[PDB]
Amino acid sequence: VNSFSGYLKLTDNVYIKNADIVEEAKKVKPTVVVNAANVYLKHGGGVAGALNKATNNAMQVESDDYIATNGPLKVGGSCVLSGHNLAKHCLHVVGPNVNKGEDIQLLKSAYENFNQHEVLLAPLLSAGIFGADPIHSLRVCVDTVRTNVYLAVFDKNLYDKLVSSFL
Ligand SMILES: CC[C@H](CNC(=O)CCC1CCCCC1)Nc1ncnc2[nH]ncc12
After folding, report:
1. CA of 25 to the centre of ligand 1 (A)
2. Other Cβ atoms within 10 Å of 131 Cβ, number
3. Domain locations along the chain
4. Pocket lined around ligand 1, Cβ cut-off 6 Å
5. Would you give the end-to-end CA distance of the chain in angstroms?
6. N or C, which terminus of the chain has less Cβ within 10 Å?
């Protein structure tokens, strides 16, 4: 038993809710919140900009130190950093950005990072400003992640569509 409320169960291990991930994180305080990161951990907009704003820019300060030490992430890769006031940990995961021409096949690799964590609160990778089809992203999620994932979908209209079209 865990503290997530109001989710619709899609599969054995995947759940979905129309929610603002920042507010969900603020209430649940999950062990892991997933950020929709880029390779530079520049949290300017989308999910990342919202999460970072909610940390009063502490996420960005920590991220800049990480990059200065380690260099950029790989597309499809991840790193674990602090969750600040939102979660114990933040798993920064880089899905491909279609608006940058990156290979959508890397979306499966991106979701594989979730399997290193028993339970996660997450957005749909490569959705939103990353330019992928959120329905495809949901399919890859369901077919790749084996751990327990609670997906927060900000847009109510999108949410209805994802549910109604789910196979
Ligand atoms: C990481 C990508 C996801 C995609 N899913 C969305 O719902 C985005 C809203 C529209 C989706 C349909 C039209 C474009 C925007 N983006 C977020 N997912 C959860 N929470 C969030 N907060 N801010 C962004 C965001």
Report:
1. 15
2. 16
3. 8-165
4. 21, 36, 46-47, 50, 123-124, 127-128, 130, 134, 152-155, 158
5. 26
6. N
CATH number of 8-165: 3.40.220.10
Query: What's the reported resolution, in angstroms, to a tenth?
Result: 1.0
Burial class (CB in 10 A: 0-12, 13-18, 19+), 98: middle
* CA–CA distance, 163 with 28 (Å, rounded to integer): 23
Distances (CA, A) of 99 to 48, 126, 130: 16, 10, 6
List the determination method.
Answer: X-ray
